[PDB]
Amino acid sequence: GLTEEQRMMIRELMDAQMKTFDTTFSHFKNFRLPGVLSEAAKWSQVRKDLCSLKVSLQLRGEDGSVWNYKPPADSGGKEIFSLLPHMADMSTYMFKGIISFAKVISYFRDLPIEDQISLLKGAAFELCQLRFNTVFNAETGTWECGRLSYCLEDGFQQLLLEPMLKFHYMLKKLQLHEEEYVLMQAISLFSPDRPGVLQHRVVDQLQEQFAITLKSYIECNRPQPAHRFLFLKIMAMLTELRSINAQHTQRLLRIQDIHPFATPLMQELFGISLTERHKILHRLLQEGS
Amino acid sequence: GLTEEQRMMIRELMDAQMKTFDTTFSHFKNFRLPGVLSREEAAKWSQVRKDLCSLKVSLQLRGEDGSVWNYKPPADSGGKEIFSLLPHMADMSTYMFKGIISFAKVISYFRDLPIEDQISLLKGAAFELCQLRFNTVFNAETGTWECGRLSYCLEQQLLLEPMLKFHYMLKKLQLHEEEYVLMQAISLFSPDRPGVLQHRVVDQLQEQFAITLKSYIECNRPQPAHRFLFLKIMAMLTELRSINAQHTQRLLRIQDIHPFATPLMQELFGITSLTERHKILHRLLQE
């Protein structure tokens, strides 16, 4: 089986995940919502950007009532940004959970504060997408976030051309365990080649052991032939997630330049002496757990 | 055809309806919306829980950009969950009531009445005239009241509820605008409302409106197939009066345990000198 150090590593990651992933989104509050009764190549790029990831929004009340928001079609105007303030609040809530996740890991808190900042900058979106996938319903095409749900709107082959959507469907198909998800989070978090990382050697050694632990876990708990090459598939998915991260960052900067919507914590993570430019990140890392 | 006096009578009513009926609800704004996320008391809440379950409707908002917000009410599960839409309905009812007050105000036959009778008539008829106006935006094929960008959609079981049976039966008559506005006048000028002093004057005015409606139908729908349309209209008015009484007692029971009525609504339904007990109504009539 697994070595006792690998067992302890998985248990610490899983403990951290449980403590910092509010999978019922019960503490996501005070978010913005679309109002009730509401250069050319750059706009053309932005309009193609937003239409790819088009979702409707549903809020179930504690009483059993339901509010449902259907987004407008693109009529060439500011109507395509109606959901961005809400998405900024949701992404910000997710990022805070990801920050708390890293803070609980012993190997992360032992790193210098500037490397903690640079790793969180490099990995925050990726870790958020990994968590979002665990609440993704591939049959209904909806992310189920507690009383909130985000449903992709109607074909499906065309939708899969959007890399972010293809990633979520492909990753869901692997039917990963919680332990495999959290090891993916650690491999992405401890990436030695993120910009600004000074302790690249210690990070690379850490990433290698998380990858070794993931491979050993898969060999210990998945005898079926449906899971052949599963470790390599997961590592390829992580490489793909890194590519999607870069495309998404460019997409956000294009939208933010035309229609600013990013919260102050997002502006820090996307870059819109390391500690001076990241007062919020610095603060959250000092507050501890 | 109609006599010149009947022609002018219809003209004033249609002019009144045109000036005071916001048929696209373009000026209904700033309304409330349901939140985004003992011994005899138990018998009171028991009767009230049944009352709200008859007032079950879905709600839709169509924004200018093409976005749509939709609200589906909860199922009855105790608690104020069954009260979630009462603030919105209070705002819609109050907006509609104000239009009815403006409607009566421009009618010369109404202005000539004493202010106390004007108050008494509006109290007795306001709800009825609101339902008559609501019938003209009711879509019988979809069960939806289309109020501009707002829609109220329901969700033989419904035909048992008198309010819904009323709206389907009235819509099936396919009345003209002139016939709706004469319906409103006949209901507004009811001599048998509580507190009416000039009973004989109001009765004579109602009869003239009814004769005008009867003559309108003979002249403009002479085909023998509309031979009893006037009597059908009068029967719908009688049924609407019955629904008005049922709605009032239902509103008072809800108000008693969960206050929701606006100040103007409190005056119209008698919730705590006829003028001094209706200061808002009096003000709206004096402007």
Q: For chain A, which domains are there?
A: 1-287 (1.10.565.10)
Contacts of A64 in chain B (CB under 8 A): 74-75, 77, 81
- Length in residues, chain B: 287
Cβ <8 Å between B63 and A147: no
In 3D space, the residue among A77, A82, A68, A126 whose CA is nearest the CA of residue A101 turns out to be: A126
Cβ distance of A79 and B67 shorter than 8 Å: yes
User: How many angstroms separate the CA atoms of B179 and B176, rounded?
Assistant: 5
Non-local CB neighbours of B17 within 8 Å, separated by 6+ positions: B103, B177, B180, B181, B184
A31 annotated as ligand-binding: no
Q: What is the rounded distance in angstroms from the CA atom of residue B230 to the CA atom of residue B210?
A: 9
Query: Who's near B156: CB < 8 A, 6+ residues apart?
Result: none
Cβ contacts of B36 on chain A, cutoff 8 Å: 33, 59, 61, 67
User: A197-204 contacts: CB < 8 A, separation 24 or more?
Assistant: A197/A115, A197/A118, A197/A119, A197/A122, A198/A112, A198/A114, A198/A115, A198/A118, A199/A111, A199/A112, A199/A115, A202/A111, A203/A111, A203/A115, A203/A119
CB-CB: which of B65, B81, B84 is closest to A82?
B65
> Quick check: B70 and A73 CB within 8 A?
no
- In whole angstroms, give the CA distance from residue B95 to residue B102: 11
Q: Which residues contact B18 (CB under 8 A, 6 or more apart)?
A: none
Return the number of other C-beta atoms located less than 10 Å from residue B27's C-beta: 10
Show the DSSP H helices in B152-198 as ranges: 157-160, 162-172, 177-188
Start-to-end CA distance of chain A, whole Å, equals: 32
Q: Which residues does chain A have within 8 Å of residue B70's beta carbon, measured at their own beta carbons? A: 66-70
Do the Cβ atoms of B152 and B137 come closer than 8 Å? no
Which among B30, B37, B72 is the top mutation candidate for probing chain A, defined by the most A β-carbons within 10 Å of its own β-carbon? B37
- Does A156 count as an annotated binding residue? no
* Chain centroid to CA B122: 11
- Please spell the DSSP secondary structure of B212-278, one letter per residue: HHHHHHHHH--SGGGTTHHHHHHHHHHHHHHHHHHHHHHHHHHHHHS----HHHHHHHT---TTTT-
For residue A75, the chain B residues in CB contact (below 8 A) are 65-66
Beta bridge partners of B139: B144
Q: Tell whether A276 lies on the interface with B, counting CB pairs under 8 A.
A: no
The answer to whether B81 contacts chain A (CB < 8 Å) is yes
Cβ contact, residue pair B67, A33, below 8 Å = no
Determine the 3-state secondary structure of B139 from DSSP: strand
Query: Are the beta carbons of A72 and B63 separated by less than 8 Å?
Result: yes
Which residue does chain A place closest to B149, by CA atoms? A37
Inspect the interface and report whether the beta carbons of B67 and A71 lie closer than 8 Å.
Answer: yes
Q: Report how this structure was experimentally obtained.
A: X-ray
Distance CA A213, CA B68 (A): 49
Give the tokens for residue B36: 């985004």
A71 touches chain B (CB under 8 A): yes
Check the annotation: does A152 bind a ligand: no
Distance from CA of B74 to the nearest CA of A (A): 4
DSSP label at B45? H
Cα separation of A84 and A34, whole Å?
Answer: 9
Pairwise CA distance, residues A133 & A121, whole Å = 20
3-state secondary structure of A151: strand
Is B280 exposed, middle or buried (CB count within 10 Å of its CB: 0-12, 13-18, 19+)? middle
Query: Measured between alpha carbons, how far is A118 from A198 in angstroms, rounded to an integer?
Result: 9
What are φ and ψ of residue B68, in 5° steps?
A: -135, 120
Distance CA A37, CA A100 (A): 38
Q: B65 contacts in A (CB within 8 Å)? A: 38, 72, 75, 77, 79, 82
**Is the minimum CB–CB distance between A76 and chain B shorter than 8 Å?**
no
In this complex, the residue of A34, A79, A147 whose CB is nearest that of residue B37 is A147
Cβ neighbors of A250 (< 8 A, separation 6 or more) are: none
Of A65, A75, A87, nearest in space to A38 by CA: A75
Query: What is the SS3 assignment for A56?
Result: strand
A35 touches chain B (CB under 8 A): yes
CB contact under 8 A, B81 and A64: yes
Q: Give the resolution to one decimal, in Å.
A: 2.2
| CB within 8 Å: B64 and A36 | no
Q: Do A72 and B72 touch (CB under 8 A)?
A: no
Q: Give the tokens for residue B132.
A: 């008559």
Nearest Cα residue to B251 out of B97, B35, B55, B31: B55
Residues of A in contact with B72 (CB under 8 A): 65-66, 68
B134 marked as binding residue? yes
Q: Which residues of A touch B63 (CB under 8 A)?
A: 35-38, 72
**Chain A residue at shortest CA distance from B73:** A65
Q: Distance between CA B169 and CA B211 in Å, rounded?
A: 23
Torsion angle in degrees (nearest 10) through CA of A226, A232, A238, A240: -90
> Which residues, including other chains, have CB under 8 Å from residue A1's CB and lie 6 or more apart?
A220
Tell me the three state secondary structure of residue A259.
coil
Alpha carbon of B78: minimum distance to chain A alpha carbons (Å): 9
